[PDB]
Amino acid sequence: NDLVHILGVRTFNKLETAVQLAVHLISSYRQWFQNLDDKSLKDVITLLIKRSLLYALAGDSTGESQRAFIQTINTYFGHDSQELSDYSTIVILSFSSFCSEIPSVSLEAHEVMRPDIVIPTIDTIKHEKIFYDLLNSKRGIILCGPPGSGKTMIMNNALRNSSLYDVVGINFSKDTTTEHILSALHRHTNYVTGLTLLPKSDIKNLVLFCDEINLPKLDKYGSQNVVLFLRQLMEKQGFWKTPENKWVTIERIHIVGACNPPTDPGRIPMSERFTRHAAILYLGYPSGKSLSQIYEIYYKAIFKLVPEFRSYTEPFARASVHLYNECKARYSTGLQSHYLFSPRELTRLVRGVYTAINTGPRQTLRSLIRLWAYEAWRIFADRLVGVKEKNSFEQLLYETVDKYLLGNISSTSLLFSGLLSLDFKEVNKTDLVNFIEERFKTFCDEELEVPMVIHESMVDHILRIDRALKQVQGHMMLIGASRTGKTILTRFVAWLNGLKIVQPKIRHSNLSDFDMILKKAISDCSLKESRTCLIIDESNILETAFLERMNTLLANADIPDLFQGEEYDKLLNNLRNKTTEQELYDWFVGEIAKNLHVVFTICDPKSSAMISSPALFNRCIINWMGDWDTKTMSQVANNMVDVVPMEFTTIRDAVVNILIHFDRNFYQKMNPRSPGYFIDGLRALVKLVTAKYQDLQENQRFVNVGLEKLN
Amino acid sequence: GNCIISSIYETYFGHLNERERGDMLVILKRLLGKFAVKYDVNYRFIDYLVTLDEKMKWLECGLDKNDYFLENMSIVMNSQDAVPFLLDPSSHMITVISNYYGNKTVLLSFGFVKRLENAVRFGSVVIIQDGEFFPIISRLISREFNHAVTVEIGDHEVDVSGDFKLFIHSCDPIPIFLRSRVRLVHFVTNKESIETRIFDI
Amino acid sequence: VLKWIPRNLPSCLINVESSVTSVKLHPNLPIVFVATDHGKLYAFDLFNYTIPLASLQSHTKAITSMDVLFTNNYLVIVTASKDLQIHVFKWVCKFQQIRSLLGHEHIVSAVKIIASCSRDQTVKIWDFHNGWSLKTFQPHSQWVRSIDVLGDYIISGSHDTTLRLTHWPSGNGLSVGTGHEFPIEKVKFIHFIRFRTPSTDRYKNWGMQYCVSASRDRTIKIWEIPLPTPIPNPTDSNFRCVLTLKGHLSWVRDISIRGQYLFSCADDKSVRCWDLNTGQCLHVWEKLHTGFVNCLDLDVDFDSNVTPRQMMVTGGLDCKSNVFMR
Ligand SMILES: Nc1ncnc2c1ncn2[C@@H]1O[C@H](COP(=O)(O)OP(=O)(O)O)[C@@H](O)[C@H]1O
Ligand SMILES: Nc1ncnc2c1ncn2[C@@H]1O[C@H](COP(=O)(O)OP(=O)(O)O)[C@@H](O)[C@H]1O
């Protein structure tokens, strides 16, 4: 009772899970004990009892807490009984360990892109086995832990690789209801006599996977409804038909939940009334050695593509795991609401190294380390707040490279592009700025009539967003001061890459119209292979259900709710016009991941809950646009006033830097600073100086004509 | 010197009252003296951008004798490159622009999209009270067009008459995207207002 | 004599004040004219490139492109400017203003002969003799970029990647074509004398079977022209491709074809010459300009009136041009 727990329940209410798991284990093993002695039988029974007690009383604790519990449960039953450890397992009977049960697989390069690829390791298979037992024990499941632990990944691993079970994926929104669940089960269950609801299959049970159950919001009287609905299904073993008013009994269904800890902002604490009937497990962060093995396997699978340095997999695995460890160490979420670190971004780092290697020329050692460092700058040190932590990251990269086995490492000097040629390689600054200038001038002459500047900070950001866009599942968050040019940057990179711009023209709008626009975009993407990029501003979002839909498609690789019925019928008809159920849906997932890219242009750091959502952190490459710098704006002002010759008594530098100084004083006398005031001032000054200097020029010309006539 | 003062006065001091605007002016003039640029010691922007005949033209429609209101509608009329914004809980800017234009002033509030489409088709000036209820107009307030001139309002292309002006007014003492594009003008009386008023009286 | 390939090193370099946008040599005299984006026309003798023979400024805005034509006799020099003015001068060794033209409401892009293309959405056709307005037409719902005239037929590719073939007396679109994902930068007919080998007698009477197209997506595509009836054929008015040509590292600006070896220029500091038979790049010239290679020009091998001499010339954005002899 006195140890640490999450979702604190009474100790009276875990005995259900403990006893039911133990009895199911004994009923599964019973028909093998007929040829066993009394002592071996008693040892097996006490081993299973100890395992049930440990995994039903300390399931919501951490690894060191679990080891303290295992030593206390060893010393509280005496040493005569069979001992239980972290790796202990009963299997054909004989005492064994989990360490000899893991499989071995060596995947090649072209399937690392799949988000559902599951790597085998020790904790994964241990939680797999306990998940199997606890699901077969006719008991509800909830998994809670820090973000990035792989709850959805472990769920898909356990549910896809079972012949007795299937998967139905539903994701809750901020505003939920009861027909979400009925709609999710509508495509996979049928009503039979509807007195009884059963899965469409007959031999395999169907389990409802719901994730982020903390997300739904309470009403004004301190009570939600969806968790009570879940409690009614997984306790009463039935529910009430809302329009028909009859009891509907469900027997082979199961309820499994995934959620964040209640300490996360925007995540409510549930009543113990619902968690009473379920079984809770803590899914913590994997240990250092487990991550080391996982990324060793990943780096071996990625250096299969470059066979010259196959023996250098192990130092890079140590460097990546260690670097993640002190990257989580030196700052946390207590300083800012976006410093959330997880294995997700290390996986995406491996993905970026993959696409850079595959889409690149012949590589050597120093090129490979500098590419790795550039990707580390790309994905780890991209949403920070100052340059001190940036140079700390640089020296951190230096020390981990020299301790795990040079050239420049800094991202400002390492310039990797894909527009200068057909391969992803090192490029030339002059060539890139010339190409960007030519592209912008032809864009201005063609479509958008803004006589607008090009400078080094914005071309660097263009490179940033182009690198983020060229990848698959490439969705990036642009947060910066207003009128900095994020929307124009997105339009420019879409024009250069080839993606066409679509925008939602929103109150005076609804879910029906927005999903009609979405379905039109989806149909165009599926039929014409249309490259779609959609631009959302602050005014384009009013309901949190929109963000829930993008969060669903982003945390997952797809939308498992809005693609159903006659829409599926016409979609498959058109696809078979162009061309199994699971394979067809997987190819749909792949093509919609390769042919869709969402951008958010949000300036306010609903938006606070948007950034704070760690599910939204999954496939968002949060790029810190930030505010302008004094040197950067001196450059842009010098470029802007160059078209207006005004040197009279140079003075252009003096006027631009004194204007800079005045607005610095104004900001200090009155958080981000919006550069709209600056650009409005520069434009007004330029137009007024030009117009009134022309007027004074013709006035002085008339005066000179009069003076020449009178002299 | 007077031109840089005029530009920075019309773009930076729209939402500042007399005391802090005087502090900003004296700090800016000290900065100009630091940077050693020629200017005018005895210069006022009202003496620059307000013509006496047009001053009387605004005077015959509800102009107040306070110089704060003078610089207020001077900044309003000088906002040509950007759309103007009128912050007034007392509802006086709407009245003065309505009786200064006349039938040109078309009064709308937040079928508003159809009314706005008709207004931009006929070239009609539109003023909305309670601008916090604001998106259709977003392209027009960004002032970016598809040259033929055409207007891609909503989902159906339209044509701009060429004589269109757009004013937005509110009363609550605002989206940041809206705020950046607009020219915010303050009309709240404070201690500096009563200071100057009793001093001149 | 028709299978000449220029050497790698440039013969000499014409230094220009601003970026070169159009180059054209005199078919008769050994002189060349370069028109820039600053409204500047520089005339340079082909064997005397030291001093500018004629540095003229008659254009307020940029000159995108220009060409010349010999009367059937003097030479016509047609120049254009983005302020919607078209000029025709007289070469004595100076430019003498012969005539001016108007009728375009926006920036003019290119000229052909006199006809011209612009960005003002309207196709307008005048006469050099008359100088008045004769023909107006709308090519597509979206405006075209590259046009040309071959007797009485015009092919046009628009910003929406739409090719249309029209006939001046009939006034109807003979065929429609498409296939790229990007707007077409240049489209050109292919005539006969595998591209110059006719297939049937009907197409021998026609003379056009293939056509080349270049865009900014680093692709060169040759398109088959469907059989027309004049009156259009609804069932025989669709283009089709047979070979995709690539190799450029940037946008393809302009293309030129002669014999079997075709020349192209791209923004990757390079000019590449290919063969239409094997598809392998016969030569890649690198480092021609510090800026992008904007335009190419050679003696017109497709016209027997002009002598296809031993000359080549290219322009660039680096305020310089390279002319190749020997
Ligand atoms: N130990 C691990 N082994 C392999 N992949 C992992 C591991 N941990 C995390 N991942 C990656 O993280 C993703 C799972 O994210 P998850 O933690 O389910 O998101 P959320 O925190 O929103 O539930 C998977 O796509 C997987 O590739
Ligand atoms: N480099 C730039 N410097 C200053 N202003 C710019 C720049 N690029 C674009 N803008 C202006 O910003 C507007 C678009 O701003 P946007 O990118 O939407 O800002 P945000 O993304 O912060 O809302 C355009 O109308 C343009 O006039």
Numbering used by the authors:
A (entry chain A): 2270 to 2361, 2366 to 2466, 2470 to 2681, 2686 to 2786, 2788 to 2860, 2869 to 2894, 2898 to 2941, 2960 to 2980, ...
B (entry chain A): 3322 to 3431, 3435 to 3458, 3460 to 3473, 3477 to 3501, 3505 to 3532
C (entry chain C): 139 to 210, 218 to 237, 241 to 261, 270 to 349, 356 to 391, 398 to 494
Give sentences copied directly from the paper behind this entry.
Cytoplasmic dynein-1 (dynein) is a highly conserved molecular motor that moves toward the microtubule minus end, transporting various cargoes including RNAs, membrane vesicles, and viruses, and plays a crucial role in cell division. Dynein belongs to the ATPase associated with various cellular activities (AAA+) family of proteins. Its heavy chain features a motor domain composed of six AAA+ modules, a long stalk, a microtubule-binding domain (MTBD) located at the end of the stalk, a buttress region that makes additional connections between the AAA5 module and the stalk, and a long tail that interacts with dynactin and an activating adapter. Lis1 is a dimer (~90 kDa) with an amino-terminal dimerization domain and carboxy-terminal β-propellers that bind to the dynein motor domain24,25. Our data support a model in which Lis1 relieves dynein autoinhibition by increasing its basal ATP hydrolysis rate and promoting conformations compatible with complex assembly and motility.
We also prepared grids with samples that were pre-incubated with Lis1 before ATP addition. Because some of our maps showed partial density for the Lis1 β-propellers, we performed 3D classifications without alignment in Relion to further resolve this compositional heterogeneity. This analysis distinguished states with no, one, or two Lis1 β-propellers bound to dynein. The nucleotide occupancies in these new maps correspond to the nucleotides observed in pre-3D classification maps. In addition, the interaction sites between Lis1 and dynein in our maps are those previously characterized and are largely the same in the bent and intermediate dynein states. Previous low-resolution data showed that dynein in a strong microtubule-binding state binds one Lis1 β-propeller at sitering. Our straight linker map also had one Lis1 β-propeller bound. Aligning straight linker dynein with or without Lis1 by AAA1 shows that the linker shifts slightly to accommodate Lis1 binding. In our straight linker dynein bound to one Lis1 at sitering, the density for the AAA5 loop is missing, but it is present in the intermediate or bent linker structures bound to one or two Lis1.
